[PDB]
Amino acid sequence: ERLSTLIHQRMQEAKVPALSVSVTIKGVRQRFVYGVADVASQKANTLDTVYELGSMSKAFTGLVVQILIQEGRLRQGDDIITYLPEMRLNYQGKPASLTVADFLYHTSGLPFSTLARLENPMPGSAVAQQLRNENLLFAPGAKFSYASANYDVLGAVIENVTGKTFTEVIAERLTQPLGMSATVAVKGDEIIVNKASGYKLGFGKPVLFHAPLARNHVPAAYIHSTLPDMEIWIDAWLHRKALPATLREAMSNSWRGNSDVPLAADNRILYASGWFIDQNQGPYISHGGQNPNFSSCIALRPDQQIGIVALANMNSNLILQLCADIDNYLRIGKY
């Protein structure tokens, strides 16, 4: 009956040690900060607590690509080969031809095996060399198949175009202009102050928190943020028209969904630049983040000025559905 009741109820059902939720509707914002960041040391979850965004990292990566595209530095049509010369991909007998768009919209056809390969930390290996000689499930652009590795390719493209590291580009193009002090793209295994411990469910919640994160996989999964920073993130998207032209235009382009793929009978939703676009009771724009030790969701309904973000320090399927529950509550008072 009450939003706080809904959120609290979902959290204990999810069994996540820490849950952070921010909900804004029509310029009104409520925050829900629950649980403990570290169970062993009993450190309480606070506004300062840092979480891994997981797949919600893709929106930052995707926006930056759109910023480069907006500037004329890059185009969706551009062949992947110029940016990653070493990376050769094969569909059937012959090597496939790929574009920036294929990775942005997950029409690349990259195998599921690629996630494990990208997430595995390699002391010395580039993504192009890492993905070389891979066999595509389908011809590029034929279907939409979600692969986390696609946005790792985009990270490499961003580095190639800019001549800078991914962390530097993220800071210069996004977090500094947006004023997000706590948001950072990690270089690798460097300790982060205030970062929550990560728990992997099953059988009970045990910690898998500290092992080096793969640098190559950061654009897809390892951007780090706080609840207040994600509020700023949500506010910028909702008030994108207030921003500088390049950033504003890039944001509009980032929300444009790729309609040139087959749609399922029960799913006609489109993928944009690190976002899912649903017209039903929409526009409804969302993405979930799922990591081994972290889970998150974000949902935006711009027409009613609705922004929802949830951050948790355990991987839970319920957390992914959590933004949808809150949106239901806002839309019809039910869930």
CB 22 within 8 Å of CB 308 = yes
CB 265 within 8 Å of CB 288 = no
Side chain identity, residue 290: Q
Distance CA 321, CA 195 (A): 24
Kindly provide the residue ranges of all beta strands, DSSP E only, lying in the chain, ordered along the sequence: 18-25, 28-38, 43-44, 51-52, 89-91, 94-95, 134-135, 184-185, 223-225, 270-271, 276-278, 284-290, 295-301, 306-312
CB 139 within 8 Å of CB 109 = yes
Reduced to 3 states (helix: H, G, I; strand: E, B; else coil), residue 186 is coil
What number of CA atoms fall less than 13 Å from residue 220's CA on the CB side?
A: 26
CATH number at 1-335: 3.40.710.10
The resolution in Å comes to 2.4
Distance CA 289, CA 233 (A): 15
Distance CA 211, CA 234 (A): 30
Long-range pairs for 43-47 at CB < 8 Å and ≥24 separation? 45/17, 45/18, 45/19, 45/20, 45/196, 45/313, 46/194, 47/226, 47/227, 47/228
Technique used: X-ray
Q: Virtual CA dihedral for 58, 62, 63, 65, nearest 10 degrees?
A: 140
Q: Dihedrals φ, ψ of 292, to 5°?
A: -55, -45
CB 88 within 8 Å of CB 153 = no
Long-range pairs for 200-204 at CB < 8 Å and ≥24 separation? 200/292, 200/293, 200/314, 200/315, 201/15, 201/314, 201/315, 201/316
Helix (H) and strand (E) counts in the chain: 12, 14
